[PDB]
Design a protein around this motif. Structure first.
Motif, PDB file in Angstrom:
ATOM      1  N   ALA A  98       8.601  25.679  -0.023  1.00 56.34           N
ATOM      2  CA  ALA A  98       9.828  25.575  -0.806  1.00 56.34           C
ATOM      3  C   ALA A  98      10.725  26.789  -0.584  1.00 56.34           C
ATOM      4  O   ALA A  98      10.281  27.935  -0.677  1.00 56.34           O
ATOM      5  CB  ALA A  98       9.496  25.435  -2.291  1.00 56.34           C
ATOM      6  N   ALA A  99      11.993  26.528  -0.311  1.00 56.33           N
ATOM      7  CA  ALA A  99      13.019  27.537  -0.157  1.00 56.33           C
ATOM      8  C   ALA A  99      14.152  27.156  -1.099  1.00 56.33           C
ATOM      9  O   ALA A  99      14.075  26.172  -1.813  1.00 56.33           O
ATOM     10  CB  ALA A  99      13.530  27.616   1.283  1.00 56.33           C
ATOM     11  N   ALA A 100      15.180  27.995  -1.136  1.00 54.92           N
ATOM     12  CA  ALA A 100      16.481  27.723  -1.750  1.00 54.92           C
ATOM     13  C   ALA A 100      16.342  27.341  -3.222  1.00 54.92           C
ATOM     14  O   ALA A 100      16.563  26.203  -3.567  1.00 54.92           O
ATOM     15  CB  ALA A 100      17.233  26.624  -0.982  1.00 54.92           C
ATOM     16  N   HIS A 101      15.863  28.292  -4.023  1.00 57.79           N
ATOM     17  CA  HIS A 101      15.760  28.160  -5.473  1.00 57.79           C
ATOM     18  C   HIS A 101      14.851  26.989  -5.884  1.00 57.79           C
ATOM     19  O   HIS A 101      15.283  25.996  -6.476  1.00 57.79           O
ATOM     20  CB  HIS A 101      17.164  28.031  -6.084  1.00 57.79           C
ATOM     21  CG  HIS A 101      17.198  28.090  -7.579  1.00 57.79           C
ATOM     22  ND1 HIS A 101      17.231  26.961  -8.366  1.00 57.79           N
ATOM     23  CD2 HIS A 101      17.199  29.143  -8.430  1.00 57.79           C
ATOM     24  CE1 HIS A 101      17.258  27.315  -9.637  1.00 57.79           C
ATOM     25  NE2 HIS A 101      17.236  28.633  -9.704  1.00 57.79           N
ATOM     26  N   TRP A 102      13.576  27.094  -5.538  1.00 58.26           N
ATOM     27  CA  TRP A 102      12.572  26.274  -6.194  1.00 58.26           C
ATOM     28  C   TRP A 102      12.268  26.879  -7.561  1.00 58.26           C
ATOM     29  O   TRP A 102      12.217  28.100  -7.715  1.00 58.26           O
ATOM     30  CB  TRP A 102      11.298  26.212  -5.347  1.00 58.26           C
ATOM     31  CG  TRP A 102      10.647  27.563  -5.121  1.00 58.26           C
ATOM     32  CD1 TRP A 102      10.965  28.484  -4.166  1.00 58.26           C
ATOM     33  CD2 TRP A 102       9.588  28.137  -5.892  1.00 58.26           C
ATOM     34  NE1 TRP A 102      10.165  29.594  -4.295  1.00 58.26           N
ATOM     35  CE2 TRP A 102       9.311  29.404  -5.348  1.00 58.26           C
ATOM     36  CE3 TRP A 102       8.850  27.702  -6.990  1.00 58.26           C
ATOM     37  CZ2 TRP A 102       8.322  30.236  -5.867  1.00 58.26           C
ATOM     38  CZ3 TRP A 102       7.866  28.523  -7.494  1.00 58.26           C
ATOM     39  CH2 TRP A 102       7.614  29.779  -6.939  1.00 58.26           C
ATOM     40  N   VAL A 103      12.078  26.031  -8.567  1.00 61.07           N
ATOM     41  CA  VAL A 103      11.614  26.491  -9.871  1.00 61.07           C
ATOM     42  C   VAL A 103      10.297  25.814 -10.218  1.00 61.07           C
ATOM     43  O   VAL A 103      10.139  24.607 -10.011  1.00 61.07           O
ATOM     44  CB  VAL A 103      12.650  26.339 -11.007  1.00 61.07           C
ATOM     45  CG1 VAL A 103      13.902  27.139 -10.667  1.00 61.07           C
ATOM     46  CG2 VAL A 103      13.010  24.867 -11.369  1.00 61.07           C
ATOM     47  N   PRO A 104       9.292  26.567 -10.661  1.00 63.80           N
ATOM     48  CA  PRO A 104       7.960  25.994 -10.864  1.00 63.80           C
ATOM     49  C   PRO A 104       7.839  25.276 -12.196  1.00 63.80           C
ATOM     50  O   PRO A 104       8.487  25.626 -13.183  1.00 63.80           O
ATOM     51  CB  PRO A 104       7.036  27.214 -10.799  1.00 63.80           C
ATOM     52  CG  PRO A 104       7.890  28.369 -11.109  1.00 63.80           C
ATOM     53  CD  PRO A 104       9.292  28.039 -10.747  1.00 63.80           C
ATOM     54  N   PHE A 105       7.000  24.251 -12.214  1.00 61.98           N
ATOM     55  CA  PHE A 105       6.836  23.467 -13.425  1.00 61.98           C
ATOM     56  C   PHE A 105       5.416  22.946 -13.523  1.00 61.98           C
ATOM     57  O   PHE A 105       4.788  22.622 -12.511  1.00 61.98           O
ATOM     58  CB  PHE A 105       7.842  22.301 -13.508  1.00 61.98           C
ATOM     59  CG  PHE A 105       7.620  21.218 -12.502  1.00 61.98           C
ATOM     60  CD1 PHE A 105       8.066  21.367 -11.206  1.00 61.98           C
ATOM     61  CD2 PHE A 105       6.996  20.035 -12.861  1.00 61.98           C
ATOM     62  CE1 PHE A 105       7.869  20.376 -10.280  1.00 61.98           C
ATOM     63  CE2 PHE A 105       6.800  19.037 -11.931  1.00 61.98           C
ATOM     64  CZ  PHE A 105       7.229  19.212 -10.644  1.00 61.98           C
ATOM     65  N   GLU A 106       4.916  22.869 -14.747  1.00 65.12           N
ATOM     66  CA  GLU A 106       3.564  22.408 -14.976  1.00 65.12           C
ATOM     67  C   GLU A 106       3.535  21.312 -16.021  1.00 65.12           C
ATOM     68  O   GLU A 106       4.541  20.997 -16.653  1.00 65.12           O
ATOM     69  CB  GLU A 106       2.650  23.550 -15.383  1.00 65.12           C
ATOM     70  CG  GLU A 106       2.861  24.124 -16.707  1.00 65.12           C
ATOM     71  CD  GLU A 106       3.830  25.299 -16.729  1.00 65.12           C
ATOM     72  OE1 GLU A 106       4.700  25.422 -15.851  1.00 65.12           O
ATOM     73  OE2 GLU A 106       3.588  26.175 -17.569  1.00 65.12           O
ATOM     74  N   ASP A 107       2.345  20.758 -16.217  1.00 62.49           N
ATOM     75  CA  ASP A 107       2.224  19.441 -16.819  1.00 62.49           C
ATOM     76  C   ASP A 107       1.181  19.450 -17.927  1.00 62.49           C
ATOM     77  O   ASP A 107      -0.015  19.654 -17.675  1.00 62.49           O
ATOM     78  CB  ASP A 107       1.889  18.413 -15.749  1.00 62.49           C
ATOM     79  CG  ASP A 107       1.733  17.040 -16.315  1.00 62.49           C
ATOM     80  OD1 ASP A 107       2.737  16.437 -16.748  1.00 62.49           O
ATOM     81  OD2 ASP A 107       0.595  16.553 -16.287  1.00 62.49           O
TER      82      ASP A 107
END
Lengths: 59, 171
Positions: free
Chosen positions: B4-13
């Motif tokens: 991932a490039a260009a402003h990936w934001v992490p998220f969880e579940d």
């Protein structure tokens, strides 16, 4: 003596007409991958990209 | 597969396994203990790991859900190897992977601790460290005497333990 020599020429021209209609049929007929593309390596299946490959990638 | 490039934001579940699939307890070892015991995980769990990847090959594209039952067993057998190696060889397993967290996790720089760890695990857990695909007339790299590639500084605890194993006659 002349009717037979005209029937000979008519037979020789109907033979050329049959040959021409045939050779027109033969080109529009579909053709194998082994004849249209290269003969060796007759399958279209690519299986390409073999270093970092995942199992389950085939289908 | 791509990163991932260009402003990936992490998220969880916030969720759970469904009831259909049983519980499986996880591997809690990090990279230096995982890299340390990698060959012994591979020595004990070879047919389980190979049945899991053979599952993944056999039913193509379904993948995840149709191979969960053997992905269960590969994790459980690796956990068995890791607690087995804890309760027998905790201090020198720890000596090994504490060497390994310096030196960029290179196996090239931790030979004197891995000799101790291989000797303990081979006499007590009866698993041997082997490199396959290596025909004879070819020496394995972690057996050779005076390698060309030595580390920068040998760790102090492992050279002290190595000398004391020399004088005990352990090794």
């Amino acid at each position: 003596d002349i009717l037979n020599e005209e029937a000979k020429i008519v037979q020789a021209l109907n033979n050329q007409r049959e040959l021409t209609i045939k050779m027109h049929e033969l080109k529009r007929e579909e053709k194998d991958y082994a004849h249209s593309y290269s003969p060796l390596f007759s399958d279209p299946v690519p299986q390409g990209g073999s270093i970092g490959k995942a199992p389950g990638s085939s289908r | 597969p791509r990163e991932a490039a260009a402003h990936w934001v992490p998220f969880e579940d916030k969720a759970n396994m469904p009831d259909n699939v049983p519980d499986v307890v996880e591997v809690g070892a990090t990279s230096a203990p995982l890299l340390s015991a990698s060959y012994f995980i591979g020595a004990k769990c070879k047919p389980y790991n190979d049945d899991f990847m053979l599952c993944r090959e056999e039913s193509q594209g379904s993948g995840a859900i149709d191979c969960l039952k053997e992905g269960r067993r590969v994790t459980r057998c690796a956990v068995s190897v890791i607690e087995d190696i804890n309760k027998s060889c905790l201090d020198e397993f720890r000596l090994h992977w504490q060497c390994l967290e310096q030196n960029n996790h290179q196996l090239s720089g931790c030979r004197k601790a891995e000799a101790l760890l291989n000797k303990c695990v081979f006499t007590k857990l009866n698993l041997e460290k082997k490199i396959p695909g290596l025909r004879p007339d070819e020496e394995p790299v972690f057996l050779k005497k005076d390698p060309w590639i030595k580390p920068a500084v040998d760790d102090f605890k492992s050279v002290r333990a190595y000398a004391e194993a020399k004088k005990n006659g352990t090794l």
